[PDB]
Amino acid sequence: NPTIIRARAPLRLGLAGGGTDVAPYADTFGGYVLNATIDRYAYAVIKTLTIPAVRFVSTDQQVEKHQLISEPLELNGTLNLHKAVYNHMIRNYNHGKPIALELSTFCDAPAGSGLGSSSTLVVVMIKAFVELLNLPLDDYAIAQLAYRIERVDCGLAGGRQDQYSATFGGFNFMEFYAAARTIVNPLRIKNWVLCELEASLVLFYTGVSRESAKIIQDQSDNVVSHKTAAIEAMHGIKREALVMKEALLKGDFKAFVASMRLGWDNKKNSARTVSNAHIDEIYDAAIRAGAQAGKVSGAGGGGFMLFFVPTEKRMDLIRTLGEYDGQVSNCHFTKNGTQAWRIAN
Amino acid sequence: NPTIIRARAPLRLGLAGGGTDVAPYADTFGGYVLNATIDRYAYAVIKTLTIPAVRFVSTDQQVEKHQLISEPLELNGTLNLHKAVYNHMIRNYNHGKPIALELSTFCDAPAGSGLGSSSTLVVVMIKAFVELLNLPLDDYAIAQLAYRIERVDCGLAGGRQDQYSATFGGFNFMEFYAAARTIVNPLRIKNWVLCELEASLVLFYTGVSRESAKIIQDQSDNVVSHKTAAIEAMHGIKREALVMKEALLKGDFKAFVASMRLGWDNKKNSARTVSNAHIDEIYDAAIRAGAQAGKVSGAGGGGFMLFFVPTEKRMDLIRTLGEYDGQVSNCHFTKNGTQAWRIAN
Ligand SMILES: OC[C@H]1O[C@H](O)[C@@H](O)[C@@H](O)[C@@H]1O
Ligand SMILES: OC[C@H]1O[C@H](O)[C@@H](O)[C@@H](O)[C@@H]1O
Ligand SMILES: [Cl-]
Ligand SMILES: [Cl-]
Numbered sequence: 001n002p003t004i005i006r007a008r009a010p011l012r013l014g015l016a017g018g019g020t021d022v023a024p025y026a027d028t029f030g031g032y033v034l035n036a037t038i039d040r041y042a043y044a045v046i047k048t049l050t051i052p053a054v055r056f057v058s059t060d061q062q063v064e065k066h067q068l069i070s071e072p073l074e075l076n077g078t079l080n081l082h083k084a085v086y087n088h089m090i091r092n093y094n095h096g097k098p099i100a101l102e103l104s105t106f107c108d109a110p111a112g113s114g115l116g117s118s119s120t121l122v123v124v125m126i127k128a129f130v131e132l133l134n135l136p137l138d139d140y141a142i143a144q145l146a147y148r149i150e151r152v153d154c155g156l157a158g159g160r161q162d163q164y165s166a167t168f169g170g171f172n173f174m175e176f177y178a179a180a181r182t183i184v185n186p187l188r189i190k191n192w193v194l195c196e197l198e199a200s201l202v203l204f205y206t207g208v209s210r211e212s213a214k215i216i217q218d219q220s221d222n223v224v225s226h227k228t229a230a231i232e233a234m235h236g237i238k239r240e241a242l243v244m245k246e247a248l249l250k251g252d253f254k255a256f257v258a259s260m261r262l263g264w265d266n267k268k269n270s271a272r273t274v275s276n277a278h279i280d281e282i283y284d285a286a287i288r289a290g291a292q293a294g295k296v297s298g299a300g301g302g303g304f305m306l307f308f309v310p311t312e313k314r315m316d317l318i319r320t321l322g323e324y325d326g327q328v329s330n331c332h333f334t335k336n337g338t339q340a341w342r343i344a345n
Numbered sequence: 346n347p348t349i350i351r352a353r354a355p356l357r358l359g360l361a362g363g364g365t366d367v368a369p370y371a372d373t374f375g376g377y378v379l380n381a382t383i384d385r386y387a388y389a390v391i392k393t394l395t396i397p398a399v400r401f402v403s404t405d406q407q408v409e410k411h412q413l414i415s416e417p418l419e420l421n422g423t424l425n426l427h428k429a430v431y432n433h434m435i436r437n438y439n440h441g442k443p444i445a446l447e448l449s450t451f452c453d454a455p456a457g458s459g460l461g462s463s464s465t466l467v468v469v470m471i472k473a474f475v476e477l478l479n480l481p482l483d484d485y486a487i488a489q490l491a492y493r494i495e496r497v498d499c500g501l502a503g504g505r506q507d508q509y510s511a512t513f514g515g516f517n518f519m520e521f522y523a524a525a526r527t528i529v530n531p532l533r534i535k536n537w538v539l540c541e542l543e544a545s546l547v548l549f550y551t552g553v554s555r556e557s558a559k560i561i562q563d564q565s566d567n568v569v570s571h572k573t574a575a576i577e578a579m580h581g582i583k584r585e586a587l588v589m590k591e592a593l594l595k596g597d598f599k600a601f602v603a604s605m606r607l608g609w610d611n612k613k614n615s616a617r618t619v620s621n622a623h624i625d626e627i628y629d630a631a632i633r634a635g636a637q638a639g640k641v642s643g644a645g646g647g648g649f650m651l652f653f654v655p656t657e658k659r660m661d662l663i664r665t666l667g668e669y670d671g672q673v674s675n676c677h678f679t680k681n682g683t684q685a686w687r688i689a690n
């Protein structure tokens with residue numbers, strides 16, 4: 001009988017260090033990222049089919065259908081990530097015999113949101129197959145596989161932090177070294193600290209970023225072409241990620257906001273398009289309204305912004321942001337990583 | 346040294362039965378409500394003061410200051426709920442001796458959202474005092490106190506369901522009887538059911554409702570003046586709340602959507618202003634886009650709508666709602682009730 005599986009994986013806020021996890025920097029100097037998963041998800045669904053076909057459906061409702069063939073599916077530029085996950089699973093776990101199924105995805109945030117959805121989507125597709133095939137893949141293995149599939153098989157450039165947040169969940173401080181070596185440090189944050197942090201964070205969706213590819217290219221060029229000042233901006237991004245991690249472990253909110261301010265200055269100095277006049281206007285208005293610090297989540301150039309605001313100024317900040325283009329929301333963290341469940345069989 | 350306490354309490358989605366928990370109906374026939382707390386909060390903060398004064402600050406930033414007097418504060422129509430909570434605590438737990446403090450509130454949703462914020466705000470103010478004074482008030486006692494303060498001391502009409510959701514948290518099926526007797530039934534929903542439900546729910550904020558008072562007045566008049574058909578609509582609201590509860594416990598999503606459709610029809614028939622042409626247009630568009638059921642959370646007339654959509658139509662629904670006036674969000678449930686923490690002393 002037909003099997004139906006669903007999997008979900010949480011999206012993430014990049015709190016600090018983002019950009020240091022990308023190849024040239026992470027391989028040369030070692031990267032640090034502090035991130036935390038939130039209550040918005042990417043999803044994948046597998047439905048086994050009673051016809052000899054394979055169908056792929058994407059979040060923006062592109063759809064491809066193929067006949068059941070004993071060769072890997074071609075990565076032709078349409079739904080490459082879906083096909084690459086399918087190819088890997090059929091080759092490695094099903095002895096190369098095609099499985100008739102429909103693989104679909106959807107997501108609580110669109111592309112370019114600064115919430116890590118591209119890689120989170122790959123993780124959740126892998127997780128659905130883990131559940132379908134009953135695979136003993138541990139969390140490190142799932143995150144590493146997602147990296148391989150996206151960055152190598154599909155050749156899409158980027159870092160490592162999103163694969164780990166989507167898989168592990170929670171607040172994590174990650175260390176990135178050469179030869180694909182990553183250490184995930186789960187942060188066991190005190191309950192009062194988590195509550196205080198949620199009470200002090202405001203999220204603001206500014207619109208779609210089209211800058212991620214350019215920023216990552218620029219940051220990689222900084223290192224390769226030895227751009228001294230821009231490399232030093234990246235060293236600053238790294239330093240402040242460690243300062244922020246220690247601030248959260250110590251419940252030191254003064255140090256937390258200071259590190260976010262320094263981090264944001266460094267991040268903007270690392271690549272030209274991280275911020276722009278539009279983002280700066282919103283940032284300036286938020287600070288005037290009483291926010292103490294803020295930043296763009298993800299590479300930069302648009303997507304979600306996050307602000308730290310003392311509770312007595314929170315409603316004023318929310319009102320102020322209402323006057324700008326974009327959507328305000330609260331910030332609610334999740335402790336669980338990717339999960340799967342069955343609906344049929 | 347100065348003490349700082351914060352408390353938070355989750356807001357709630359009224360899944361079924363709302364309106365049957367209000368006095369004339371609940372006292373005469375018994376009410377049923379099924380509700381669930383979500384990841385948006387009301388907050389209260391108490392700061393002890395070093396000057397002989399008391400200050401109250403509201404979510405919309407009204408502010409009152411008074412000198413320290415050994416008489417109850419007058420409920421003059423400005424910040425009555427703040428003053429009434431303060432009055433009760435000073436009289437019952439501090440032998441009538443004034444305490445110098447600032448009591449402030451803020452909230453993740455504005456007034457008229459259909460998320461139960463008015464009563465949730467009272468609960469969270471009580472919880473801050475529970476923490477400040479180290480009171481042994483259990484959950485039933487906190488919810489009952491919040492009812493008394495809001496409905497009796499401040500004379501504001503309404504039901505009982507919000508006090509209980511804010512205090513207890515989670516998915517609850519509540520039974521309301523005469524003489525203020527309430528039974529809270531926590532629903533121990535299977536993990537797959539919760540995940541499936543979140544994957545199938547879409548929230549849509551339509552704007553502020555100004556209809557709550559009118560709807561509740563009308564529903565109360567139905568009973569008092571023996572309006573036969575409108576009373577029978579309310580009996581239907583009640584019946585479908587029980588059907589929906591059993592559907593969730595049995596993981597029966599077909600029965601869940603059928604009960605929501607019948608519930609919504611009954612709810613609209615119980616009071617003239619529950620829906621309107623604007624809400625009906627949005628509802629109609631959501632159904633055409635693929636939603637299977639939907640309703641307004643809270644009394645009606647505006648505020649949050651919720652839609653049940655099969656996962657293969659979810660992104661289409663989200664796109665469609667984008668074309669209407671209001672804000673789309675995912676739906677994420679919380680299991681915890683009201684909580685407090687300390688920042689100073
Ligand atoms: O560049 C910021 C950020 O962008 C994407 O989300 C990924 O490539 C991450 O690995 C990286 O940290
Ligand atoms: O009338 C619907 C709803 O409105 C408010 O939230 C309260 O008065 C509740 O007790 C009631 O169930
Ligand atoms: Cl970052
Ligand atoms: Cl994203």
Ligand SMILES: [Cl-]
Pocket residue numbers: 113114115116117297298299
């Ligand atoms: Cl991102």
Ligand SMILES: [Cl-]
Pocket residue numbers: 013014015017018019297298299
């Ligand atoms: Cl980032």
Ligand SMILES: [Cl-]
Pocket residue numbers: 359360361362363364643
């Ligand atoms: Cl209801």
Ligand SMILES: [Cl-]
Pocket residue numbers: 454455456457458459460461462463
């Ligand atoms: Cl509300």
Ligand SMILES: [Cl-]
Pocket residue numbers: 458459460461462642643644
């Ligand atoms: Cl309400």
Ligand SMILES: [Cl-]
Pocket residue numbers: 358359360362363364642643644
């Ligand atoms: Cl309701």
